[PDB]
Design a protein around this nucleic acid. Sequence first.
RNA 1: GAGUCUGCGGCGCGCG
Lengths: 229, 229, 97, 146, 98, 53
Amino acid sequence: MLDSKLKAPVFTVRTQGREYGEFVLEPLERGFGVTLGNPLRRILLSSIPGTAVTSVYIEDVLHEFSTIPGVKEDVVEIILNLKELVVRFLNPSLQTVTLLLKAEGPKEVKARDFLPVADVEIMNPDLHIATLEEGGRLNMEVRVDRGVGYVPAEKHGIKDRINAIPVDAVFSPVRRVAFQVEDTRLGQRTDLDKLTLRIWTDGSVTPLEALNQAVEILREHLTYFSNPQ
Amino acid sequence: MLDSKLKAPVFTVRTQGREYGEFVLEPLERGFGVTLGNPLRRILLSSIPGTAVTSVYIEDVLHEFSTIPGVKEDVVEIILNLKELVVRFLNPSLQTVTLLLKAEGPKEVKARDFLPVADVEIMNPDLHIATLEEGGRLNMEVRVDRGVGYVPAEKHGIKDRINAIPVDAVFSPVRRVAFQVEDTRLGQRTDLDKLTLRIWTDGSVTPLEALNQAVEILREHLTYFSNPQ
Amino acid sequence: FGKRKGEGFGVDKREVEVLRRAEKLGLVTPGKTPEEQLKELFLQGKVVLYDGRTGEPIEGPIVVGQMFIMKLYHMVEDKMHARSTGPYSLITQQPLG
Amino acid sequence: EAALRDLDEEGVVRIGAEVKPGDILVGRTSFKGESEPTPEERLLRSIFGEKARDVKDTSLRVPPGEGGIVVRTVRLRRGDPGVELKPGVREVVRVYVAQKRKLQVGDKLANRHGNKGVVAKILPVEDMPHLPDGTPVDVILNPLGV
Amino acid sequence: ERVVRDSLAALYAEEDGEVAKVDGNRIVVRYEDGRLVEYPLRRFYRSNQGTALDQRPRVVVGQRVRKGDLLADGPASENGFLALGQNVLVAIMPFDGY
Amino acid sequence: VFANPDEALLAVAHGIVDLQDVVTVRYMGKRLETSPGRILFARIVAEAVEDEK
RNA sequence: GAGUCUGCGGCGCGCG
């Protein structure tokens, strides 16, 4: 095409790794960069489905505010580090996967120390769970689920073992979203929008992958306006 | 379908006349009513295309700042009242329609006094164009077009007749948009959104027609994310 | 708000959120119904407003109203003066227009 | 000739004609030198066309800035009715121009209390602060100035 | 009210009567004492400062007018009241840096 | 309690914590007890000039 | 291969 259609949003992409991805799209009519950017943002953080540590159970620990001997880190610092663990399952059959791990003695407990599960993968290997000294006994069972958005440990309250402690759900693989609408010049009229939205991802999915899922959720919702009543 | 898909936004409609039209859609996940409602609002006011008085020509009047004998109102007050005239054509073949009207003597000139045009309709009948005294001679030709947004009379400068005077273009068929997101109950989880947006229209187009065009412009823009570079 | 009740709808998630931030501020007596709360906040001369760009409310009531404002006379001082080259004074050789 | 359309009445500009900066409002022709013709301008004239009107263009033009539509015009010729024409003054020519001043970014507005200020940006109704009901605000004043 | 009246903006009705003709240029009323005056209206005149001075008739044809009632509005009057600039809805908040 | 820095602001955007609220956050080597907003400012500066430390 | 000549001193008011 040549006139109004060839003059189409030049979708440009700049992505390094699977964490950062800038996305520029221009030109846009009046105030559309903002009309597009904010919904995409609201989707990119709540809609994108993922996996987060739902609950944990240290064998000798009863409360979340306890400390384990031979272990530098406190129960709270550890459950904190677990929220940082990014797991990636391969299919619907895996709704709730309980990862198991037990390490003793003078060793550093990394996320690769968890006994491998058939359909689940751990992309956060070197994540540091704890530092064990001597006579350091650490046996725990950390639950993992697939959900959407953020769920306070208070909202769900998981109880595999009566003494287990729930943890805050961090389900979006996208940490932060950012969009700017800078003015762009197109020969004739100076009043134009340029929308560039930068997306950050924990690694599970990519910025481009997330953005596409986002636009889809919006599109799927735009069709829900079909049958009147 | 039965489970998650049958549980789909129930698009309900309540529209009286072509001016008001409420639109309810529920249930929605978390903070989506706001994610959908605002973009649609930003589109509904800026983007929808319509009709407005583009130019006028009083037979004996040469400039915009003149006064016509036997006519209370001044050329300026009249061309002003003309911007208030809402016309509605039925098909693309009508790009520029010139409405003609001529009235004389002791009569009040309303918008229904315009000689009817085949494919054009005037839903702004009783609009008061002028008050004619005696020996009040008023013959004019007011141009009408289909466009988008606001076009200063200075920007287009229409010249059907050399002494005609251009008028400011008002192309949004919508005066105001309003949306509310009230909490709705779905058996299991109480945190849900319900988006009901009320749209008002001058009559040219309907609330429903506007909403649809709106959702389309948004979808058309969501596809502009196709070719990276 | 009266026509709002009859026209068919109540309060927004937006309208409630701003209310939270509002009572945490000290503009509305905690414990009252949003209907009653919004009234108390409206009486303050402030109402809830959405950004228009994002559709999200603006955290915190903002006042709005009918303020009479006038436009001031545009002198030839307004209509800007930019000069490249031009006239010059007869006795002093400095630029003048 | 393109600059002589609006100047329809011989000399004077026609009423109801959009005058933009730099257009001729009224034409006039005086003489080229102080007392003598020009030796270098004599050769140029003769090369393309010696018979060139010696009279110089001194016409009332639209001064940079703005003009609008011409609404009224006044011309006092030789046999003056009851007017006082100054000496030397052969005749005068008034041209009344009018123009709608839509509010633009340059303009300044202020309320009766004292808040003065200029318009920085004309936002599209599309995204400026809007009320629960669709009614959007017209102007947004900066709190800090109070 | 007073400002437009003591100033000579709007045109007021001398004595009581009825209206005869309502031109965009003149309003000739007919008072009840049996007299009728034509009141021209400064159509569009050049103010010293270049502002518009027009008198816009506010009275319809054949209207019993009270003594001292506005027949036409001055350059800046709405309805016999002083009016400069307009009543606009305004939000008192900060924007980007606009 | 928020692990990574980002972690703290997402909860904000989701309506769990106001920016002016007092929470705990894990930064580079310390468990610091500072509000989200304060942490956000830290970022803006740290971003303005890449030498974060 | 264009360039002359006019707009000064003061006064008043208004903006910043």
